[PDB]
Amino acid sequence: AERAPEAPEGAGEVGLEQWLETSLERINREARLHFHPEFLFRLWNTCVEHWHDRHQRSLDYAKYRYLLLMHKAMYTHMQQGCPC
Amino acid sequence: LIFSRFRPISVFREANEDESGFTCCAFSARERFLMLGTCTGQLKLYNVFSGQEEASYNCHNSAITHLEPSRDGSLLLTSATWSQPLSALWGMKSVFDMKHSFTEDHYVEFSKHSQDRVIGTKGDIAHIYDIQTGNKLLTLFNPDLANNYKRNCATFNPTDDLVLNDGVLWDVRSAQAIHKFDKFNMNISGVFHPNGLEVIINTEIWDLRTFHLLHTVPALDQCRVVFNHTGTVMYGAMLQAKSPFGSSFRTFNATDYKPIATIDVKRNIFDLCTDTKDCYLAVIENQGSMDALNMDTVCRLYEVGRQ
Amino acid sequence: MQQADSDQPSKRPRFDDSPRTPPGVELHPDYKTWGPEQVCFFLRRGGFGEPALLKNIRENKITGALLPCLDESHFENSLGERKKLLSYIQRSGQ
Ligand SMILES: [Zn+2]
């Protein structure tokens, strides 16, 4: 039958903190080239007002959910076709 | 005309997440697995029969936009969204390792007949790489003939003789443009019919022998087009120029370009794919909202033929 | 064997595993260009992210240009808080 290859050695090793903040740094720089700040703040504000404030989750969880939304927004935009 | 009926039978979610973020799908070489790409760069293999996550890999630093296994299960091509390297070639046989990266190529695919080459796309430029060495064999770019399509994907014709890039037809062995197709949209660069006779650019269907227009088909506008294994049917799902993904996909007859159905899954379609035996249709479905918060994206499996 | 630049954590943050135990990008330079979303970020940084206030900011579509022209009666439509908010907007940068 068809076997799925083993994960590489060392997968999953990176820490959340380091991965989260590197990610947030990269995607934020990148997003600013494609979106106007109102949009960027719409995603940030929902995530923080909803996950951090109403549902009382850690800022890291809220940031993580913002990261997920920004990635999908970057995905949509580039599939549509980027002028630059 | 059995491509008028589809019955949802299975659903895949990301198993370790509150919100699923599939952005891409492709059946594995021997179709035991549904390979699902995620919005953060991960690749995940689900067993189609059992429905369970059988493997997870970390491939890129941005959403997966394209997956192509090689027919021999040796290799996998992936593309990301905006993070370098944008595309890469991976080994599939014992351990998952990266064979080669294509730093600036935002889209890649295998040559069709003999899968020994990768053709990549960086903006208006097409690159042809050798699979074993990863060396750039040639660069296809003609500044005079460019159409500057915003969604340009270079591609080999079925026999690897020809390349379509940015609406220009290239003869591979002379490495020269032999025809520019006139531009009638801003985005879609086009695709070869599997029969090797026609070129489909957006609405316009062209004849390769004579370069005469055959059909204009308004339903295809801005649609990502997908042929079933036998080349009889094209699936089509809009992505326009509130979510820009179409809520539905249309099937057509690949011989006469006449509609067969218009299927509404009541969810934004991110991608779709179909197996070779034409049993299943996998569709990445997203929960559209005016609400930014809800972006849960799953993969629903359809049985083709069954109501 | 794993490329370290494409690596991700194996543990994913989960809602039920992420309780709070008790910034990202920057606003436009001139207040005038702010939509209500940038105004809400601004208000939250001052400690005025009461969920009711930001709801009104959105429904009434209050922009940044508008933001200097307001009074405590508007802010009613908690007298002590209204004084602080009125003070916050006054003393601020843009
Ligand atoms: Zn852009």
Author numbering:
A (entry chain B): 2 to 85
B (entry chain A): 1075 to 1315, 1327 to 1392
C (entry chain C): 1 to 22, 34 to 88, 93 to 109
Reproduce the article's own wording on this structure.
SIVmnd-2 Vpx comprises an N-terminal extended arm that precedes three α helices. The side chains of amino acid residues H35 at the C terminus of helix α1 together with H78 and C83 at the C terminus of helix α3 constitute a zinc-binding motif that links the helices together, similar to that observed in SIVsmm Vpx (Schwefel et al., 2014). However, in contrast the fourth zinc coordinating ligand in SIVmnd-2 Vpx is a water molecule rather than an additional cysteine C-terminal to C83 as occurs in SIVsmm Vpx. These are (i) a Vpx-DCAF1 interface on top and side of the DCAF1 propeller, (ii) a combined interface between the N-terminal extended segment of SAMHD1-NtD, DCAF1 and the Vpx on the side of DCAF1, and (iii) contacts between the SAM domain and Vpx on top of DCAF1. In addition to the ternary interface that “traps” the SAMHD1mnd N terminus within the complex a further DCAF1-independent interaction between the SAM domain of SAMHD1mnd-NtD and SIVmnd-2 Vpx is also observed.
The SAMHD1 triphosphohydrolase inhibits HIV-1 infection of myeloid and resting T cells by depleting dNTPs. To overcome SAMHD1, HIV-2 and some SIVs encode either of two lineages of the accessory protein Vpx that bind the SAMHD1 N or C terminus and redirect the host cullin-4 ubiquitin ligase to target SAMHD1 for proteasomal degradation. SAMHD1 is a dGTP/GTP-activated deoxynucleotide (dNTP) triphosphohydrolase (Amie et al., 2013; Goldstone et al., 2011; Ji et al., 2013; Miazzi et al., 2014; Powell et al., 2011; Zhu et al., 2013) involved in balancing cellular dNTP pools (Franzolin et al., 2013) and regulated by Cyclin A2/CDK1-dependent phosphorylation (Cribier et al., 2013; Kretschmer et al., 2015; Pauls et al., 2014; White et al., 2013).
